[PDB]
Structure formats: C-alpha cells, structure tokens
Write a protein that binds this ligand. Structure first.
Ligand code: NA
Ligand code: NA
Lengths: 411, 75, 412, 75
C-alpha cells in the first residue's frame, strides 16, 4: 500500500503568521480574539473575532493580483507558499504532472461578494467587477498555487463547511494513495469576519456575545459558553508518497495513516445528542489506520464552544474509547484561535502533527468550570508535556451533519 | 492635472506599472502585461473617473494609452 | 481485482426537461431550452437569456416551511437526488445506512439567497438577516439534506471545482466506493446561477453571449460566430454502486464507471492554454485508469462551452489524444441545447454519456452552421446520430482555475 | 380576534401547520415542531408584519402561541 507522509507546513492564524509562531502562542495559551475594527459593529450582536493581525502578502502577491482575490484566497496563497518553501520541493517539467492540490473553503469570498453586490445595487451590473467570480469561488486558491508553481496534477476543492479542512487533506492522501499524484498541497482558507459573515452567524444565534471580554468568550466544554467565536486564517500541508520523499531527502513531520468520514443524518446545523456521526468518523479513521482507540495519545477535538456540540463530541469520544476515555487526552485549540470554519481542520491537523514532533499538547483555555457529569481531562488552562505519544487524532464536524477524522503517526 | 496625466495615473495603477513605463505607444496587453479582465477593469476605472459610458464595441478599440487619451479627449 | 463501480440510478432537472427521460428525448431531437429571463429586470444587463428550469414543482418533496430554508440550487439538487434514489430502488436499512453516502457539489452555490440576505442587510442592518442564510446558501447542504432525508450515514463530501464540480463529485464518489468507505454513493451537482449577480458577474468578465435577438442560436460551440457561453440551471444525480452489491440486489445497471482522470492547466485563472495540454492530460489519465485506448472511445461528450478559445483548446486536446482516430470518434456539446450548467454540467452530461450507451444514439451540437476552418472533427452537427458499435463514452469538464476532469463509461 | 388573530396566522404560516392547531396555549418547540431557527424566523415575521422591533431578550420569552399574542398586543 502506498504510504503518505507530511513534508511541508504553512499557516496563518489569529495567534501567528507562521507555523512556529502560531505553535508557540498555542502552547502558551494565547488568545487571538479581539474587537472587530474593519467595519462598524454598533448594530451587530457580536463585535469581536479572531482576526489575522499585520497581514503582509505584498512580497508574494502583487497589488494588481491582490485586487483580483478575496482575503481568504490571499490567506490560502500565503500559507501554500510557506508550505511549498518548507518542503523544498523542486518543480520540474517531469515533476509537474505528478503534483497537484486539494484546497477548499467553507463559504469563500464573502467580502468581495458583498462589495460586488453593493456595486450592483448602487449602479447596476455595469459596476460589477470582471474579477467577481474568479475572486470569490472556493477553488481559486488551488487554482493560483497550481499556476504559481506550475502544478499539473489533480486539483480538487472540498467545501464541506467546518469539515473542509479535514476532507481536503484526507482525499489528497487518497489521491496519492490511489496513484494519481506523488505530491499534494492540501488544506483550507477562510475569512468570514465580514458584515454578512458575522451578521449571518449571529442571525442563526450561533455566535458568542461576550463583548465585554472577547478573550474569555471561547469556552469549549465550560458551563457558561454561549456560541462559537469566528476565526480567520489558512492551513496548508504538503503530502507526499513515502518513497518519493526519502528519495528526495525531504523532511518528514509525520505520516498520515487514518481518514474516516461519516454523516449525522440528523439536523442541518445541530448534532445528535449521542454523537453517532462523530463516533462513526473516528471509528472509520481508526480502522483505516489499523489501530485502537487506546493507541491515540492526543485528540485535537472540534470543540466549538457550543452547548450541544461540546456535549455531543465528548459523548462520541467516550463511546469510541470506553476504558481509554479517562486515559486519552483531548483539547480544543479553538479556545485560543476561534473557529476557522473550512480552515479549522487544516490548521488543527498541523497542531496534531506538531504535537507528535514536540511531544506536547496545547491547552483548552477559559475552561474554568467543566460540564457536570463529564469526566474527561480537556487539558485546561495550561499546556501539558507528554511522552510516548505515537498517534494523534483530529476531528472536524460541519453543517449538514458531515464529519471527518484524521490520524497521524510519528515518523 | 491634465487629462493625459489622469489617464496615465489610472493606467499605471490598474496595470501595476511605474509611470515611466506608461508610454503613449505602449499597448496594455503587449507592453504592460494585461489580459482581458485587466483591460476591462482599466476601462471601467476610466469610465468612473471621467463620468463617461464606453460601449463594449468602442472599448475593444481602446488598446493603448493613446487610444484612451483620445477617447477621453473627444468625449 | 479492484472494486468495480456501476450506475444504478439517474435523476435530472434541465432546461429541456424535468426528468431524465424527457431531457434525453428532447436532447436527441435537438431541442433548445434557452429563453429570455423574466424573473428579474434585464434592461441594463448585456445578456438577457439563459437555460432556465421551467415549471419547477417540489412541493411533494420539500414542504413550504423547508423550502424557505434552501436556495433554488439546493431545491434542484434535492429533487434530482430524490429521483435518483427512487430510480435505484435501493432500500435503506440500518445495516445498509453506514455504507451509503453522497458526493454532491456546486460551482458557486446559493447566489439568490445571498443577494436577498445582503439586500436585507443593506436596507435594515444585520437584524434583517435570516437565521437560515448560511445553511441555505453554502454548497454542501444538498448532500446535507439528502443524507438527512434518507438516513444516509456514510461519507458525505462536496467538491466545488467550478465548471468541473459535476465530474469530480462523481469521480471521487466512485473512488470512495472503490476504496471501501462506501458501497453506494449519490453523486452529482446542482446549479442555479441565473441571478442578477450571476448574469452580471459572468457578463462583467465578458464571458457571456449577448445574442439577445435569438437566444436559442446563441450557444453555438465550434461555430465561427460564437461569442461566449449561455448560462443554464438544473441538477444531475447519479447513484453509483459496487458491482457485487448491485448484482446481489438485482439493481438497474445503466453502465460501468471505469475511467476518472484529473489535471490542472497551470496557465491562467480563466483562460485555457491554446494547445489544451491540461485537457489532454485529464483524458489520458482517465484512459489509463480505465485501461483502454483512445481508439476504443466511440463518443466524447465534450465540454464545449462555445467560447472562442475554449472550443479550440478542447478540439486541439482531442486531436492530440486520438491522433489517427480523431476523424473517427464522435464528439458533441449538449451545452448547445441546455446551456452551461456550471457545477452541475459534468453531472447531467455524464448522464447523457451513459444514456448514449443505452440507446446507441448521440445528441447533436445544434447551431453548428459553419465549423472552424482546418478542424477535421465530426461534431455531430444539426441532427442526432445513431451508432451501432459503441462500448465506451467519455465526458469532459474544465473549470476556472485550470482544473479539469474526465469520466469514462462502459456499456453493461 | 383579527389584528391579534394575525399572530396565529403567521404562526401556522411560519411553522407549516394547520390553523386549527395554533391553539392559544401551544409551545412552538414542544407541539408545533419548531427548532431554534424556526423560532427566530417566526419572531422575525412577527416583527415584520406589525412594524415593531423585539429585543433578543424579549424574544427569548416568546415560546407559546398565546405568549406571542400577549406581548405583541402590549407593544
Ligand atoms: Na480538530
Ligand atoms: Na462534457
């Protein structure tokens, strides 16, 4: 069987603009949530989000090209450039047809959609920009990177809401394991902290309104949570066949061994109380990797800090692990970064990988009072050093009941 | 600024070129590296900063800096 | 060995029919489903026509309370998916559930309700935004609703690769079956972009035809007087199934899905390379995955969007892939009749390629009065074509960002 | 009852349920099958017809068909 390993990392997050700075901030329990300042939030119930601070893509994307792409596309391009550079891969004309991408987004270019529709409502269709469609649709990140690096392999884009980041990575490995490609740039990008984004998520009553303390708003598994916090950024991995990577002398962070999928078949936005879909996804990832739940040392949980979602995921983990439920570690980095939506499963996969490299686990901050009856250790407040951790599991659940899980093995 | 300076400023900004490259006999596509959508939004910016509607048939005819200054002059 | 995938169910909404068989009958007769747009004012719009879905009635499937929670493209995808599930005759048990999923996507998604919600926002602030905005507009919700409606607990993904979505969603659905994560998959795409933002944005890119005086003659792939593509709405859904799982239940088997290739142009964000290298790579990958030769291909359901550069590029790619047999193989564009269904194109066109193998007939490329000079390909113009020995059909889809996909189907 | 009876009409219209079921003492979530989103859009429809505005805290306590009528009449 063709084995898939990760040979490159790239990331933009509300707590850092590189992989290592983000990882440092996550291990220190740093919050990247702050008040929104790019649009007026007087009438909005939520006035804060996890924003990307001091974003500079001018050295990679020219201003003429910047105007042709939404912010989430710029995030995905920057993270993809970081991952390609971190892999050191050399694109030749014999290499081209074997290297592709699998990068997606949950909602895509809301910001430029609003801008073009505002021009339309003000001055008709003649004021719409000719770049409207190619600047907003979710696959254009994969489009630009393939043009920038001359990648001629398979390019797909999975947009499964908050699960995109995991699915895009998983099937990238599948595309490698099947033989359609030797290298794949996979991940997701998201920038939904727009008027439509914040307003629409607040209309569904899914956002936190803790405006008086935004850094304490994201409280996964805590008794006083009141919805999730929006986050922006992008995560990119470089997946490679194992023999192709050793022959090239690449750096190898970890191996991607498990990928499971499932559907809740329940509700369009809420998960079932028992968490049957999350458990099915984790069990399929286990069986696809060929391990047991006990062999999992760390689970980077979805942990959106919603009342129903946290309980459902904790119940699903308890079901899947059983005796090892008191043993296995679980934490939610969304307590620090917020919810990056289609990029969540991307950046959190990176965290799962880096845990196995540094044998450390980022915490679940703001976890003052855990839920009653829940006996899980969510690594509260402070990070925790661990040893012997050979497997990590990353979860992602999205609207429509779609679920995905990834398992990573050391070296 | 005269209308020639305003046309050259719009061109140099839209196509992302220094003002010394915006030459009167330079083509948007051939000399300044534009595609269809580049020239489309270039014409749209000219239409905005001059309060003039340019039909699509008459916009394809405008391919160089001189064609732009001549259209803004006569209209 | 490898697990083989077969098509056991069909469902379709198109501008030329609201079922699979009516659409296929109308396509073989060279019927155009293009007409003037009347649901919004087109005075200032350069393009005033499209391929619309006529007399859409989903009230027996989607209740009126539920309809307000989903954009038109979601309603199209749900209806087509229900038709495909019913056409397969599959019985969902609790032992069957975990092995059946979906792979349904869209090119742009819910433009209509995005416009409506943003208009409410610009008029009355974020308080006027509907609580259903996100779940009614994002592209995966079709697969979301169907999996809830039929209790499907298997893998559900949603590929949004622009004009290539329909093929990719189907291809990886087969992959998910061949890998062992599912035994049966509902795959396809849905699209409803004939909105103010859709028509205006595609015309802003100067990509639409402006033949308002004769909309049915506007879509003319490979014709010397083409001036851009025509927008079309609808949805296509296939039910893919493992061969042993399908043979055991005695299901309907339209064809076998044998080839699936992917490629990237690595050229431009909206324009294809002149030689069509990416299209050729996609077709070659589909061939090698199926394990056949170009000569074995009887019909190619080309992408054929009726753009000047795109038609030439795909014709060049077909010339490269087939070579000596290029003058023999049949190729046609059903977009001459239905228009461009964007993320649903590759879905409905896959159905056409399958139905070609069942009826041994080929729908034409209408409005093809004068083909390009120097091109010696037979584009099945004006009328349909009856074929006797046809065992393989090829369906292409190329989208923005240079992404490409190809599917090969074998008879029985 | 009309100009009050309006409330029962919007309730049955929003929840896709017969008018004979919108009894004065009915819980949208318990009896009429309303989810949270159905409950927000229901309150939003009540806000739209009567040309009034309900705070979110005042909307949290509107959970029955008769509850809606009392508060609506009030403002
Ligand atoms: Na996770
Ligand atoms: Na096709």
């Amino acid at each position: 069987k063709r084995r898939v390993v990760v040979t490159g990392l790239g990331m933009l997050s509300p707590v850092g603009n590189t992989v290592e700075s983000t990882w440092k901030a996550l291990l220190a329990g740093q919050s990247g949530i702050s008040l929104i300042d790019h649009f007026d939030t007087s009438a909005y119930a939520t006035k804060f989000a996890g924003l990307v601070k001091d974003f500079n893509c001018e050295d990679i994307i020219s201003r003429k090209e910047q105007r042709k792409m939404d912010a989430f596309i710029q995030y995905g391009i920057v993270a993809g450039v970081q991952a390609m550079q971190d892999s050191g891969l050399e694109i030749t004309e014999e290499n081209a047809t074997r290297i592709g991408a699998a990068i997606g987004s949950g909602i895509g270019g809301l910001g430029l959609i609003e801008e073009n529709h505002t021009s339309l409502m003000n001055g008709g269709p003649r004021k719409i920009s000719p770049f409207f469609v190619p600047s907003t649709i979710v696959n254009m990140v994969a489009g630009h990177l393939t043009i920038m690096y001359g990648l001629r392999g398979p390019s797909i884009s999975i947009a499964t809401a908050c699960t995109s980041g995991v699915h895009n990575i998983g099937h990238a490995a599948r595309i490698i394991a099947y033989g359609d490609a030797d290298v794949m740039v996979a991940g997701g990008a998201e920038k939904a902290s727009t008027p439509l984004g914040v307003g629409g998520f607040g209309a569904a009553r899914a956002l936190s309104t803790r405006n008086d303390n935004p850094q304490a708003a994201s409280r996964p598994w805590d008794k006083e949570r009141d919805g999730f916090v929006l986050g922006d950024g992008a995560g990119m991995l470089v997946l490679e066949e194992y023999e192709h990577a050793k022959k090239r002398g690449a750096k190898i962070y970890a191996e991607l061994v498990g990928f499971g999928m499932s559907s809740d078949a329940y509700h369009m936005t809420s998960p079932p109380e028992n968490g049957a879909g999350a458990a099915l996804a984790m069990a399929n990832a286990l069986r696809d990797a060929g391990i047991e739940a006990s062999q999992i040392g760390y689970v980077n949980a979805h942990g959106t800090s919603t009342p129903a979602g946290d309980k459902a995921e904790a119940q699903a983990v308890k079901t899947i692990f059983g005796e090892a439920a008191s043993r296995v570690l679980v934490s939610s980095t969304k307590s620090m970064t917020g919810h990056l939506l289609g990029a969540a499963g991307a950046v959190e996969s990176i965290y799962s990988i880096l845990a196995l490299r540094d044998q450390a686990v980022p915490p679940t901050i703001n976890l003052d009072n855990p839920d009653e009856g829940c006996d899980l250790d969510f690594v509260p407040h402070e990070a925790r050093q661990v040893s012997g951790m050979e497997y990590t599991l990353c979860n992602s659940f999205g609207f429509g009941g779609t679920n995905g899980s990834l398992i990573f093995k050391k070296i | 600024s005269t209308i020639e300076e305003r046309v050259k400023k719009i061109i140099g900004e839209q196509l992302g070129v220094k003002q010394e490259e915006v030459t009167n006999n330079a083509s948007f596509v051939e000399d300044l590296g534009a595609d269809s959508l580049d020239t489309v939004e270039l014409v749209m910016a000219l239409e905005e900063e001059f309060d003039t509607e340019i039909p699509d048939e008459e916009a394809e005819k405008i391919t160089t800096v001189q064609a732009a200054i001549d259209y803004i002059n006569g209209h």
